[PDB]
């Protein structure tokens, strides 16, 4: 949303209210613009979890946003970001999240819980074609069970930029099973 | 009493400033908070 | 002017109703045998009461639909409770049965409508261990 800059001035820039952030795209880049105030708001929403874009000179109103960056620093306040769009029908490198609900199985009865080393899902469905919020939770939880890649259950866009059997999300003893 | 490290008893016990001093107060002998 | 929880068919258990009512202003014996005149129509199952005492040291009064949580137990068949609700949950009951039980408690029970009535049944049977499975 907006964000400007692109000359050659990171220090002061990298200072005050404007944080660096390259204009990255397949084939071309352009001095860092943006701002340490927009990043906020938007970013605050769900960086590489949905997507939008800003109007700098109406130039090229496109999506793709961030494919890297960091609040690095100790303090925990980012500085020096990466920005890449995608006006193509190739959209792959697509990492969008996936949520459950709380389906009661090991929890609200077994107190047991479940780790989700997954959460996210870098895949590649129908380029410029993804539900900013995709949910899938067949339920199940408790004892020494576990679910991961393999099973899963992918809708429409048949990608999987990923593999089978691997960090899905299981149920462990928040105390004992 | 605790001179050092006072922090709210009864769901009331107030925060007062005497001599810049901060000494707990609240409807209870069981709160005579002071530092 | 006092609320109590006493058994039917019975009336004068030294320990429970001797002290209380006895001091709050109540002739334990009379009210006792007055109770027996009541809970003699629904013995075996506990019955609560709101015995009040004015200015003379006597009287009594109402008997209100016992506390669900427990009346439900008298229907299924289980003394106390597993050991903790939603932690030891394993007391599966049934619908209809349930819907036909709350249809009998309606009285001191919430309003006079199914949904409501039935719902509270699902509530109580939950806090103890009686799952609406």
């Amino acid at each position: 949303m907006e964000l400007t800059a692109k000359p050659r001035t990171p220090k002061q820039k990298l200072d005050e209210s404007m944080i660096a952030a390259v204009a990255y795209n397949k084939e071309n880049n352009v001095s860092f613009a943006l701002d340490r105030k927009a990043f906020d708001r938007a970013f605050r929403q769900q960086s590489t979890t949905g997507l939008f874009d800003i109007t700098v000179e109406g130039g090229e109103t496109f999506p793709a946003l961030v494919k890297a960056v960091q609040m690095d620093k100790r303090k925990r306040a980012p500085i020096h970001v990466d920005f890449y769009m995608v006006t193509y029908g190739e959209p792959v490198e697509v990492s969008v999240p996936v949520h459950t609900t709380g389906r009661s199985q090991g929890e609200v009865q077994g107190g047991l819980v479940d780790i989700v080393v997954h959460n996210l899902q870098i895949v590649a469905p129908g380029p410029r074609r993804i539900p900013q919020e995709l949910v899938v939770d067949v339920t199940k939880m408790n004892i020494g069970d576990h679910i991961t890649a393999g099973d899963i259950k992918l809708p429409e866009g048949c990608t999987l930029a990923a593999d089978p059997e691997l960090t899905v999300v299981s149920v462990l003893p928040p105390r004992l099973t | 009493k605790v001179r050092s490290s006072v922090k709210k008893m009864c769901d009331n016990c107030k925060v007062v400033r005497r001599h810049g001093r901060v000494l707990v107060i609240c409807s209870n002998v069981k709160h005579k908070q002071r530092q | 002017q006092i609320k109590l929880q006493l058994p039917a068919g019975k009336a004068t258990p030294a320990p429970p109703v001797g002290p209380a009512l006895g001091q709050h202003g109540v002739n334990i014996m009379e009210f006792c045998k007055r109770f027996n005149a009541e809970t003699a129509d629904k013995a075996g199952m506990i019955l609560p009461v709101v015995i009040t005492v004015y200015e003379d040291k006597s009287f009594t009064f109402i008997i209100k639909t016992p506390p669900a949580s427990f009346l439900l137990k008298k229907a299924a068949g289980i003394e106390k409770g597993s050991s903790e609700p939603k932690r030891k949950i394993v007391g599966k009951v049934t619908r209809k049965q349930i819907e036909e039980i709350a249809k009998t408690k309606m009285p001191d029970l919430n309003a006079n409508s199914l949904e409501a009535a039935m719902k509270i049944i699902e509530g109580t049977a939950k806090s103890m261990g009686i799952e609406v499975v």
Partner: protein, 138 residues
Amino acid sequence: SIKPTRREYISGIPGKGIAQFKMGNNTYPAQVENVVEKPVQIRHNALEAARNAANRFVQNSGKFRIRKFPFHVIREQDGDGMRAPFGKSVGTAARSHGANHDFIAWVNPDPAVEFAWRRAYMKVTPTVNIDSSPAGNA
């Protein structure tokens, strides 16, 4: 930064003796956690402990995860007196590099665990920073 004699000649190859990592429960978004800023050969023991007392006060779901762990150690009095000092080991930990990802109170809505960790900081030693993660804490 004086450190030890080697990873297998003086004292290197241990378990360090402690109480493992993970606790609490999952959670996809909710970012609930703790880190620091202080530098200190984190007092093993003190360490191990601390964190633990953490579970002691909570119990289940709240990423009682914790990303620390000592692995080297000091030494001192053993032998003659003060001069040519050989070495007697004791007390390993790990450098808390001037702040960083401590342990995580990670989960949907379960501050009942935030306060926890909280109780976890209180403890600890080197001050500590109370914080949230990508998003905050819900």
